[PDB]
Design an enzyme around this catalytic site. Structure first.
Site, PDB file in Angstrom:
ATOM      1  N   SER A  40       0.837  -1.183   0.000  1.00 17.38           N
ATOM      2  CA  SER A  40       0.000   0.000   0.000  1.00 17.38           C
ATOM      3  C   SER A  40       0.878   1.241   0.000  1.00 17.38           C
ATOM      4  CB  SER A  40      -0.935   0.005   1.213  1.00 17.38           C
ATOM      5  OG  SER A  40      -1.539   1.283   1.387  1.00 17.38           O
ATOM      6  N   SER A  41       0.824   2.005  -1.082  1.00 22.89           N
ATOM      7  CA  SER A  41       1.682   3.182  -1.177  1.00 22.89           C
ATOM      8  C   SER A  41       1.184   4.262  -0.224  1.00 22.89           C
ATOM      9  CB  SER A  41       1.742   3.702  -2.613  1.00 22.89           C
ATOM     10  OG  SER A  41       0.452   4.029  -3.091  1.00 22.89           O
ATOM     11  N   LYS A  79      -5.067 -18.995  12.449  1.00 27.41           N
ATOM     12  CA  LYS A  79      -5.107 -19.997  13.493  1.00 27.41           C
ATOM     13  C   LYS A  79      -5.286 -21.425  12.974  1.00 27.41           C
ATOM     14  CE  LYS A  79      -6.207 -17.531  17.821  1.00 27.41           C
ATOM     15  NZ  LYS A  79      -6.417 -16.124  17.411  1.00 27.41           N
ATOM     16  N   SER A  84     -13.822 -19.970  21.813  1.00 31.89           N
ATOM     17  CA  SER A  84     -14.902 -20.165  20.836  1.00 31.89           C
ATOM     18  C   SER A  84     -14.862 -19.214  19.646  1.00 31.89           C
ATOM     19  CB  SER A  84     -16.252 -20.018  21.530  1.00 31.89           C
ATOM     20  OG  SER A  84     -16.378 -18.710  22.063  1.00 31.89           O
ATOM     21  N   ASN A 110     -11.882 -17.322  16.843  1.00 31.86           N
ATOM     22  CA  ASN A 110     -11.078 -17.752  15.701  1.00 31.86           C
ATOM     23  C   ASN A 110     -10.391 -19.102  15.911  1.00 31.86           C
ATOM     24  OD1 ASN A 110     -11.788 -15.585  14.135  1.00 31.86           O
ATOM     25  ND2 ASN A 110      -9.864 -14.475  14.386  1.00 31.86           N
ATOM     26  N   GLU A 155       0.442  -4.473  20.521  1.00 35.82           N
ATOM     27  CA  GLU A 155      -0.480  -4.800  21.607  1.00 35.82           C
ATOM     28  C   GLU A 155      -1.375  -3.634  22.036  1.00 35.82           C
ATOM     29  OE1 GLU A 155       1.324  -5.816  25.409  1.00 35.82           O
ATOM     30  OE2 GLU A 155      -0.175  -7.398  25.705  1.00 35.82           O
ATOM     31  N   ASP A 172      -0.377  -6.701  28.894  1.00 39.59           N
ATOM     32  CA  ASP A 172       0.328  -7.645  29.755  1.00 39.59           C
ATOM     33  C   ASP A 172       1.676  -8.041  29.177  1.00 39.59           C
ATOM     34  OD1 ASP A 172      -1.558  -8.956  27.839  1.00 39.59           O
ATOM     35  OD2 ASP A 172      -0.401 -10.715  28.428  1.00 39.59           O
ATOM     36  N   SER A 204      -3.824 -10.577  10.497  1.00 39.16           N
ATOM     37  CA  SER A 204      -3.954 -11.892  11.086  1.00 39.16           C
ATOM     38  C   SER A 204      -5.327 -12.535  10.893  1.00 39.16           C
ATOM     39  CB  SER A 204      -3.626 -11.802  12.582  1.00 39.16           C
ATOM     40  OG  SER A 204      -4.331 -10.718  13.182  1.00 39.16           O
TER      41      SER A 204
HETATM   42  C1  LIG Z   1      -5.673 -15.134  18.060  1.00 38.71           C
HETATM   43  C2  LIG Z   1      -5.575 -13.896  17.226  1.00 38.71           C
HETATM   44  C3  LIG Z   1      -4.450 -13.096  17.377  1.00 38.71           C
HETATM   45  C4  LIG Z   1      -3.478 -13.339  18.514  1.00 38.71           C
HETATM   46  O1  LIG Z   1      -2.819 -14.587  18.399  1.00 38.71           O
HETATM   47  P1  LIG Z   1      -2.063 -15.182  19.687  1.00 38.71           P
HETATM   48  O2  LIG Z   1      -1.291 -16.410  19.303  1.00 38.71           O
HETATM   49  O3  LIG Z   1      -3.098 -15.456  20.756  1.00 38.71           O
HETATM   50  O4  LIG Z   1      -1.155 -14.058  20.192  1.00 38.71           O
HETATM   51  C5  LIG Z   1      -4.233 -12.064  16.488  1.00 38.71           C
HETATM   52  N1  LIG Z   1      -5.108 -11.831  15.454  1.00 38.71           N
HETATM   53  C6  LIG Z   1      -6.229 -12.608  15.298  1.00 38.71           C
HETATM   54  C7  LIG Z   1      -7.146 -12.287  14.152  1.00 38.71           C
HETATM   55  C8  LIG Z   1      -6.475 -13.651  16.189  1.00 38.71           C
HETATM   56  O5  LIG Z   1      -7.592 -14.441  16.034  1.00 38.71           O
HETATM   57 MG   LIG Z   2      -1.981  -8.418  25.913  1.00 31.33          MG
END
Ligand SMILES: *Cc1c(COP(=O)(O)O)cnc(C)c1O
Ligand SMILES: [Mg+2]
Ligand SMILES: *Cc1c(COP(=O)(O)O)cnc(C)c1O
Ligand SMILES: [Mg+2]
Lengths: 307, 305
Positions: free
Chosen positions: A29-30, A54, A74, A76, A200, A206, A303
């Site tokens: 993405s520019s 996952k 319950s 992803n 984070e 944490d 992710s």
């Molecule tokens: C689970 C999840 C994360 C975090 O993954 P972890 O291994 O728990 O740190 C990040 N993005 C999405 C979309 C997730 O479902």
């Molecule tokens: Mg955290």
């Protein structure tokens, strides 16, 4: 020196799962390059089967024999684990509080799960899950601390290092740290000169507090954040890897997360879930400007897309 | 084919703990020989430091900060002694509702007590909290591999002390002692039998081996054999499943009679849990053991009574 996995576990997980997952593309993405002053690459796990990375860890846990798989994660993870179970011809039991809203119950049923009820507490979630496991002669698969799962998430890094051969850093959202730990294990084994950065929420920081104080410091209260996928604390297996192999952790506000997610929707036309906006928010954050100008090529893991 | 410990771990535990435990004697009883028709040998772990075999596993876990357990009987007592040898505090998690006499007894053997509520739930989570706050480790009474490896050292001594032994008879609770011993005997001399002895009132191990799957006690067992109320677990079951030759159950009455027999006729102050192995060899079903199994060593596992 010796963590709950080594890179060998990641390589084995790669071979184990690659015929059943997507080698997701890396996009650019520019507009986001201009905003950050960096050369960004977006690893599109939002395109992955089940809608998030996952399935990597979940499929590797099921193929690594059990008559059933069980989890009380319950979201992803549950969705990914149920697909992995389907692929392997076994049932997946998802433990859900009886007080969960109908819409969530229906969504969990809709992704193929057999639902078992618990009461709304961490205590009840674990014991009902244990009972189901013991009655069905199956296995519980933890969403982030199970070594087979961590090893599977690490395969993301294998692909990125191939797809972006001159990458200088990876930016990874962190919840339980399964993805972060698997990636850290892999990058530092193969190309330790590449940086591994976590991203984070400030409201769930944490991991950030842990690396600062040098010991595991779980969230005292259930976190309030729109980044629903990273509410889990890091744990006994992911922390040591994150302690020793992750270069930095960048926190982002709720507002940063929202703005970044909207930026991705509007200007990249990618339907990420807000948890996936966390890594983008990190590279846009004020403190990321302290990252050396030599760190030019940065790959962000998008992710998930389950929204 | 590959369990949570190997023989090598047992031998390493022996070297690791030998300077701080007793090589307890093996004793005999012509009266009990007569009653059983066997040649009995009694491994006297009632003479062991802290009053039970448990110091073997406890010390090996500490030598292999602070230590934490909510097993407040022989394991807590053993763990506290191990901790003190190593210069670290031992925290024992005890329900608040526990009798004053029991709180005083736990304090008296050197523990720092932390209270919980009288549930397995509360025991584990309070124990876990104490562990994080003290940067310590929880040492489980029977499922921790370092503990299992430690208890196994009993078998090293028995095989040395009774060269012609045909069988060992072992009380089973969590199966730490049983599994450690089975791993050792079957690695060194598999022709020697490994028998477990269990209360009928707490017969999870027996039922597990029968059904071919881990079958924990559904309810808290009621038995005078306090030390074997625990069920076998995820680490000890597979060893017991594959490497233990037989499990003999005994009634509450059998346990009582055997314990009094040992007190009155052997003059050894065993605790009733230690009577369980003796009851097993006296039991009706033990008469089905081949006459060729003549030399039988029974572990008198404790004297804390
Ligand atoms: C689970 C999840 C994360 C975090 O993954 P972890 O291994 O728990 O740190 C990040 N993005 C999405 C979309 C997730 O479902
Ligand atoms: Mg955290
Ligand atoms: C703990 C104990 C046992 C049982 O040992 P496990 O490893 O739990 O099977 C037997 N006898 C005595 C005296 C004990 O304290
Ligand atoms: Mg039992």
């Amino acid at each position: 020196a010796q963590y709950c996995i080594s890179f060998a576990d990641v390589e084995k997980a790669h071979i184990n799962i690659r015929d059943s997952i997507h080698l997701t593309p890396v996009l650019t993405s520019s507009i986001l390059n201009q905003l950050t002053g960096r050369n960004l690459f977006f690893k599109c796990e939002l395109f992955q089967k089940t809608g998030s990375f996952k399935i990597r860890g979940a499929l590797n846990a099921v193929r690594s024999k059990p008559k059933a798989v069980v989890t009380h994660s319950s979201g992803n993870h549950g969705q990914a684990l149920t697909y992995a179970a389907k692929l392997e011809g076994i049932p997946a039991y998802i433990v859900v509080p009886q007080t969960a809203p109908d819409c969530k119950k229906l969504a969990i049923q809709a992704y193929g799960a057999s639902i078992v009820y618990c009461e709304p507490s961490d205590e009840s979630r674990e014991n009902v899950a244990k009972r189901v496991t013991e009655e069905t002669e199956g296995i519980m698969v933890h969403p982030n601390q199970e070594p087979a799962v961590i090893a599977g998430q690490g395969t993301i890094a294998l692909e990125v290092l191939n797809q972006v051969p001159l990458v200088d850093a990876l930016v990874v959202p962190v919840g339980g740290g399964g993805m972060l730990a698997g990636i850290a294990i892999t990058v530092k084994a193969l190309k330790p000169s590449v940086k591994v950065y976590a991203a984070e929420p400030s409201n769930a920081d944490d991991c950030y507090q842990s690396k600062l104080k040098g010991k595991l410091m779980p969230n005292l209260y259930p976190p309030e954040t729109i980044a629903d996928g990273v509410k889990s604390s890091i744990g006994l297996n992911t922390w040591p890897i994150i302690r020793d192999l992750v270069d930095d952790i960048f926190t982002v506000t709720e507002d940063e997360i929202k703005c970044a997610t909207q930026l991705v929707w509007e200007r990249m036309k990618l339907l990420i879930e807000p948890t996936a906006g966390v890594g983008v928010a990190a590279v846009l954050s004020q403190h990321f400007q302290t990252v050396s100008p030599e760190v030019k090529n940065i790959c962000i893991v998008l992710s998930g897309g389950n929204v």
